[PDB]
Amino acid sequence: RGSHMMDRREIQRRAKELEPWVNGFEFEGIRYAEGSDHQDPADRARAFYEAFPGATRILELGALEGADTLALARQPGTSILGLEGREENLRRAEFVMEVHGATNVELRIADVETLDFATLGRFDAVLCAGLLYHVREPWALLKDAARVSAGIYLSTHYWGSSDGLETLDGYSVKHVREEHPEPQARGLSVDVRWLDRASLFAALENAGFVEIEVLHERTSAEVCDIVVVGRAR
Ligand SMILES: Nc1ncnc2c1ncn2[C@@H]1O[C@H](CSCC[C@H](N)C(=O)O)[C@@H](O)[C@H]1O
């Protein structure tokens, strides 16, 4: 066993100490931990780098257990900063990076609703998946991405109706208590706001992402799903 490898005994001990996992943990064909009741990272990374082939410095928001972070880091020559709001999730992600020897990744605790994004430097693109519907002011998160980058890969839900919605900063919003079924995926505020489709596209435009490419969309009168690439000047 190469000197760069963590001992399997220690992989086992630490993976157990880190339970419960959200997406589980497997390494060398050994399933150490199972995930919870609630895209494949390699496929997401492929789509991300189809959109941003020249990217060498990436910001990932809401890194969870580091699965996308690791997939994005496979290519040498690209460095990733992953931000995660829940310390318990971050500790998992840090363990994953250590087990895999992913030295081109940095992980940091951060609350995207309060962080000063101007402290982070510049990125070729921002990955923002599974996060926009966990914040109070989603338009502001999009503005923060634009402060540091000209590209965003955004995967989010939006709300399929405009009827009866509230209005904040001119956007139509569904304002609800944060009750996402996976507790370890929840936002850091008691509440969240979802956007209707028009307000999501307006918020992208108003942040500066004036060119929007839709990669995937599933519509309903209620929960909708979308993946878009936003590009700013
Ligand atoms: N305000 C906030 N600041 C930073 N991270 C947050 C946050 N609100 C939620 N998160 C984190 O964002 C993640 C949401 S689940 C999405 C995980 C991953 N991006 C994916 O697409 O599969 C969780 O790890 C959660 O703890």
Is 180 within 8 Å of 134 (Cβ atoms)?
yes
Q: What determination technique applies here?
A: X-ray
Closest Cα to atom 22 of ligand 1: 130
* Nearest ligand 1 atom to alpha carbon 184: 26
Q: Is 48 exposed, middle or buried (0-12, 13-18, 19+ CB in 10 A)?
A: buried
The residue with tokens 């929840």 is 186
* Nearest ligand 1 atom to alpha carbon 64: 24
Spatial neighbors of 121 by CB under 8 A, at least 6 apart, are 57, 148
Q: Is 146 exposed, middle or buried (0-12, 13-18, 19+ CB in 10 A)?
A: buried
Longest dimension (CA), the chain: 61
| Structure-derived torsion over alpha carbons of residues 8, 9, 15, 19, reported in degrees to the nearest 10 | 150
Closest Cα to atom 9 of ligand 1: 187
CA of 165 to the centre of ligand 1 (A): 25
CA of 84 to the centre of ligand 1 (A): 6
- Listed resolution, Å: 1.1
